[PDB]
Every structure is written in C-alpha cells, then in structure tokens.
Amino acid sequence: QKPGETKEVHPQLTTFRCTKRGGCKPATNFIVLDSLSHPIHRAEGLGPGGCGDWGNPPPKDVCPDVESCAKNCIMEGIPDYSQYGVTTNGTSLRLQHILPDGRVPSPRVYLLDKTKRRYEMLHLTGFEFTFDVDATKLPCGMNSALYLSEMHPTGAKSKYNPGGAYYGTGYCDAQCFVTPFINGLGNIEGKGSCCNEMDIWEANSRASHVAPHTCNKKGLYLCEGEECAFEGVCDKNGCGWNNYRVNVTDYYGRGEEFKVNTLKPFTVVTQFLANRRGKLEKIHRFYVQDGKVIESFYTNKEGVPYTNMIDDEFCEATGSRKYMELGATQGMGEALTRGMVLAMSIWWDQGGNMEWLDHGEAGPCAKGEGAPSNIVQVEPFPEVTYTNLRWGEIGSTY
Ligand SMILES: *[C@@H]1O[C@H](CO)[C@@H](O)[C@H](O)[C@H]1NC(C)=O
C-alpha cells in the first residue's frame, strides 16, 4: 500500500552475535509490526473504508489493478507501538496479547537491521540460535511463537511498494494464506503467500513444539488453486518435535516435577547441525534453567526411532510426508543458508483451540480448555517476554 503521513517509530532492541573466542557482542536491531496490522485506509477524496481483510483479495472498487491499489490504499505509520502490545526495554521484547483496556492486538513483529530498511537476515545452518523466555503467563490454547520465514530482505521494496521492510511488508509462511496485499502489492488475483518456514518456538507454559516446514520453491511463492492446499508446494504440518508426542510426559510443564519448570524463566537453545559440506542434518533443542543445562529428552515411543534430535529418519517415521517430499532436512537447511527473517508473535485460535500444540497426544490441556473464553479465566492478560536474542557459533551462546 502507499505510506501515509503518520510517522513510524520503531522500538529498538539490542541483540547479540556470539563466538567461542569473543563471547557475545551487542548489535543494534529494531522491531517492526506486520504491514497489515498498520492502519490501512482509502486515500483522501475517496469515501471512508478499508482495503480488505485477511483471507481475501483487496476490493474491486479501489483496487481493480496493482497501480490503482497502490495509490488508493494508504498505510499509516505507527508512532506508538505500546498501543499494539509491543514494548522493548534494553534487550527484552514484551508482547502482550490483550491490553489492560481490553483490546486484543495479538502482535506479529519482525526484526529489522540497524538501518531500518532491511530485515536482519539470519543464516543459521551450522550455527545456534538462543533466547531467554518468560512463559508463565501462557495457559493452554495460547501460542507464543518465534520463527523464521524466507521473506525478501527489503520486504520486496519496489515502485508500487515504497514502504518495504520499514513498514513490515512481505510476510509469507508455509500455510500459503491469502492476504489482501502480498509483497506490498494489491493481491488482485487472490493468490496465497508461501515460503519455507522454520518454527523454532511455538509454545505456552504447558507444551513446547519445534517444527521445520519445507516448500519446494525458493523465496516467496504466490500459489493458486491446489498449489496452496495440503498437496501443494508447502508443508502445512511440518515435522513436529514435542516431548508429549513421543511419550515423554515429565520434561516440560508448570512445576518443580518437570525438568523444565515453566513457572520460572529459562533459556532455549537450538542448534542447526550441518555436515562438513554445509548441509543441514539434525536440529537439536535443549534448555538452560537456573544455570543448569537440561539436555534434550530421547524419544520413548514404539515405532519411533530412538533419538534426541530432529532428522530425516525421525520425520519420515512420524509421518511427515509432505516435509520429506518438499525437500526434507536438507531443503530446510538450504532455505536457512539462503537467509531468513525472524518473526515473533502471540496468538490464540478461536476455531480450533490450538489443539495440535498442547492437547491429547500433544500435551495436558483438556478438550475445550484452549478456547479463548476459557483462556481468560485462567490468565486474563496473556503475554510473553523474549530476552537476550543471540546467535552464533555452536556452543557459544550459553
Ligand atoms: C530495563 O532494561 C535494562 C537493560 O537490560 C535492565 O537492566 C532493567 O532491569 C530493565 N527494567 C525492567 C523493568 O525490566
């Protein structure tokens, strides 16, 4: 869309780059909200109204084609991010799903580099990514997410999308959703926005999930028809790793009897182990709490290979068929080597209660517990805090 006049004031966040010799050195980064969460309205002189909702093409009256859409639809800057539940303090990023006044902003943000005009590109194959998290205010049904998507580095800044990464344009993920704007351009044909996605962290205080999702395309791919569906170009399900799905029920949870106790802050480490040729082979998650390393669990389920890391064998044996067909671990690794953008969000799921994350085989949440009206009876103001985001050499971040 065309940037309006209101100024965009991005929250600053200090992050780190670590090496075994130099330790962790500070780096300057900024946060930007998704472009479609910015106020988007019709140009002055046009009647009042918007330029489409999630799930649909933009309106035929103001957006008959890309060029008209680019001048009729205005995206204002956000001068105060705290109104969207996003605040930073030093090296911490706090995301509030629901504000004290009742609004539910459910924010999704991306990490910009120091110039504010390009996303920070992470190249993680062969490296490690680590952060500290406070997940205590996340009951069943909530998803606090921290993940990577293969978005364009400037948000596809172009003639008709002058705002670019500075306004958070260019989102994509493995679900191939239809949004009114794609790469900052009106999505006249109603295509889906698809790209490789690595879900480092999808969790609440009750369950923790990790999942790479491959696509057989590079960068953002605009799908149509069956390309957007289950048998299309992207792996909707991903190759999931959750201690509950592999029958280890005492590893993560609220309370002293769990190895990772979600009643207190803890550190999450994820290593992308590659062979000497640079190809991704395994993904390894382990945690640090109260100065103690808590090693990964090993699977403990009949029919599943004994292993403490995600790999092709584990993925194939657990039925991650689309994952294996659209590239497998090696294809996930190639997207990670090409460069991915870091996204952080907090959300709930009115339609399905986030059951794949923490219910049944995936966790301890009862049927109906994850509904929004029940979440707020347990915690009226769910929120997550991410602190000390840091990446670098294997073994150097913790
Ligand atoms: C704000 O950030 C600084 C720098 O990390 C930290 O020392 C201080 O404790 C933080 N304040 C709060 C309220 O967390």
Ligand SMILES: *[C@@H]1O[C@H](CO)[C@@H](O)[C@H](O)[C@H]1NC(C)=O
């Ligand atoms: C799950 O683990 C328990 C032991 O903790 C074991 O008795 C049971 O057989 C396992 N289930 C499967 C399906 O592997």
